[PDB]
Amino acid sequence: GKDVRIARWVATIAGLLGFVLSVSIPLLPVT
Amino acid sequence: PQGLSVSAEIDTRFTTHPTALKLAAMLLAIVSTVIALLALWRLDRLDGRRMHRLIPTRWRTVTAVDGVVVGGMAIWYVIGANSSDDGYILQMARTAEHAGYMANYFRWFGSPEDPFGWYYNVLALMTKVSDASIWIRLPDLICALICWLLLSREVLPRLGPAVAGSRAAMWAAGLVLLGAWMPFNNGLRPEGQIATGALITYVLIERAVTSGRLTPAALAITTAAFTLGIQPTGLIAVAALLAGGRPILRIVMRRRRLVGTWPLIAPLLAAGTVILAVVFADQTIATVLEATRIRTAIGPSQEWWTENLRYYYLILPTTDGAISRRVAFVFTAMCLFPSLFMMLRRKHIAGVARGPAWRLMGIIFATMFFLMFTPTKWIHHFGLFAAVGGAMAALATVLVSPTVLRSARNRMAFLSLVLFVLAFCFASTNGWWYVSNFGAPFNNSVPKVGGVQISAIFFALSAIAALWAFWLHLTRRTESRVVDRLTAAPIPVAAGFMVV
Amino acid sequence: YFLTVEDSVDGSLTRRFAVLVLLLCLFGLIMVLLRRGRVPGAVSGPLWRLCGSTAIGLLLLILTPTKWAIQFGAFAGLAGALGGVTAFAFARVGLHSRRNLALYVTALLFILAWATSGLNGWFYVGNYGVPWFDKQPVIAHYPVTTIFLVLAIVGGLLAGWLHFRMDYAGHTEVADTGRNRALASTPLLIVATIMVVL
Amino acid sequence: AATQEEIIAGLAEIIEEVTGIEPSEVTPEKSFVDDLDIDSLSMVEIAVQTEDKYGVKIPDEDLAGLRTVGDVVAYIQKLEEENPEAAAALREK
């Protein structure tokens, strides 16, 4: 438990998925 | 009669709208970007520093230049000229709500502004209130007030106590900002916004270097991305990153002793690549490739080795390159090159920081270089320098002061150069574009004071100044006093002349 | 402008190369004479006047009435004597660092990519049998300018990678051996003899 | 390292890089905002750089109480005299 041990995870995760979900926007179904 | 039929199938390939999954991804690649930035901020707040004041004490000051610049950009926003691409963009923005996409309205078979049209979707929202000329051009006045507020309070005080303390530098910065913003960045072309993004990026990078944090260096990458997403000529915003990449890497490789490398590299990627979720909101990579194919197969291609056209169009005496359309570039080159040759010789100027002063010149050089590789070679692309020419002129006015250039020969040579630049400026017509050309004094001919041009007068003055410099060269004289009066702040006057 | 016009025989590639190399040598020697106080080995007295002559000539070329691109031939006596001092100053310059050498090489490669983007035509009768007089040079089907450009961008990326790490590896010089004593100075001889042979 | 002529010689090298002020102008009597035109956004940069070259953490609440150069040298002498376990003396004196 810490306010930094969790901030490191929230900066690694939710910073990596916010990039893998951004290069997949040009490639997605559109109506 | 039964049997007859004609069944055409329309090509509606650009009128798309995201599904229930593209929306879920676009509304997530932003939440999980602001969250990454908040985590990076909580990490950066480890050093024990906070914010004591909402407004730094170097901001709460008013000079006689603030009044002049504000009142000269607030009455030129009413009576001033407009660029040649305002009808073009207004016509393409009034119809974008009905068409369903940002269609290029007059050319290329209705192919949209592929990846470079997140800004026109803001004018498409502004046109819902009203499309008057006094209202639809507001982001061109706000992005000038902001540009001045930055250039006069964050950029000049950073360049050292000799650029912040000398009044001639502030006057030169203001007058060159005005002279480079008046003819280019007043219409609807998004050059006044690129010139402000490329300045916010530099300011945020300088703040990161100052405070030693990284959270104002991911916002710099976000600003550079959102500025490059406006137009292909927004590469100045990434030149501002390349110029300030070494002192940022110096903090990336210095903070990682406490937190590691991933919690520092991941948000720098999430903030950098978040521009895709805004560029590809309505369009798609297939339609973007098709539009680009059309635009390159039909419109002006202008391969990179044809970049001399941008300057060939400038020396011709036409409405394209006029008296006012040359200042933005000449007052940048004439203030950049001798300042570079003087920063090379001297390594201690006693009042100028070398880091910021070198980054400011690297930005301009990289911009003037990578202005090639742009799909089109127009003159409107000289409006980018409106923001970074003010600081360059404010640095040159200090570098050529009678206390920094101690020899009268060098100052007289610089005065001759300034007069020659004015002579080159005044060697063309005074024409404006469509209806701003109604009633202009010399809208059709080169200005003449009677028989003799005005460029000839400035050339005959530059020749005399060069002869004076040569006579000070031969006899080895450096203590002349008349040149101390003549060569005191010659750039502010040369810019105020064109502004007036 | 006349010197660099697309699909023109006034400015060929052989004519763009000469002027671009002259300007490179001039503005590199001036930068070395400003940055460093002198060039070791060459006396700095006439080395300053040799650059002053070229600069004042390029400035005096403003007054001429006709400004064709063939009037650069008056500097063929200064370019020969200047490119033999440039390839000697830049040896010592780019021997003290691995970044200056990369910058020199990529500047040469960009000058080559810019020059090779034009024709090879000479004149009315001189174009009888010349290889690339009617079209810009291609190797098999790729233009040569794109090859030299993708080499220049690689050189630039390598120079940037050597610039960004000057704070971690300290500042280490190259060893003054035979393989490096004659490697920092062979550029501007390689490309110059290539253009001469061409 | 309580020698004033060393503390000032080390502070001038940071001031000259951060701001550009010559190292001959930094006397133990000048003020950081009147005589030298060093605002607070440069004092924070100086306090950041002094913790990278040498190991010294200048607290945020006490950095604002450093008006003159003499105040800086007195504060450093005070920080040094009551903390003889200055392990930050490694290869940086």
Next chain:
Amino acid sequence: RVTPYDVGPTPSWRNLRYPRSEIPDDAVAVRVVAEDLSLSQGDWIAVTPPRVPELQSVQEYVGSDQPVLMDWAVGLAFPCQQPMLHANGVTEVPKFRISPDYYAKLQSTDTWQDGINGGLLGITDLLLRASVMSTYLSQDWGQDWGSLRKFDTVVEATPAELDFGSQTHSGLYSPGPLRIRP
């Protein structure tokens, strides 16, 4: 006598303006006096009886709801006119066309928006017939503000109904290249 104002190019038909200020308050009759006085052929003259036009503002004649084809230069001078909207690939049919002055309309707003390279002048050449109207710039005669044309249909036709549908693609789908050049 009253010297006329002459704006447009002069091998062709034009209007010659005689402002009623240059005539006094006692002029109750007017008559033309044309004189060639030149032997060479190539220069000549032509005359229509004088007329006092019954003018009207463009904002009043061209309403604020009729579709208009404005060139890419005339967009900020005419903010209240309505452009030629398009939706679902089908464009509206304009009624008037607004364009800049002669030496601009000729070499800028005709090569740019040309029919062979995607412009809107590939529709109004197949479908409509343009007839130039007679416009004047108020109180600033002798100035070339531009030109206003009128589009008349070749044959009487009505808009379509354009059956609709919807389909979901996969981000990489492309039904083939467009028809650009032969």
Next chain:
Amino acid sequence: TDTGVIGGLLIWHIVGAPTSDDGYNMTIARVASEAGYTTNYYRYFGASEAPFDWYQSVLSHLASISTAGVWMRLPATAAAIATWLIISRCVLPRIGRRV
């Protein structure tokens, strides 16, 4: 280096394209023996080349022996051999002994 440069400069005096004004300065020099002066033969209403006609007045004496292009361009090859010899023996040894 002198041998190589002079060889590549003499095997270019033979197989080498002439410039854009080899025919201008040639007729100007051939029709200048008569006509009384150095007339600009293709333009300017017979106006002479008044300040710049000491080179055509030498070409007009070379164009009387033989008009062959390999002989009229002889002062444009000696002025290159001398230029290179100067550059390599009086200029470079002056700039430095080690250059």
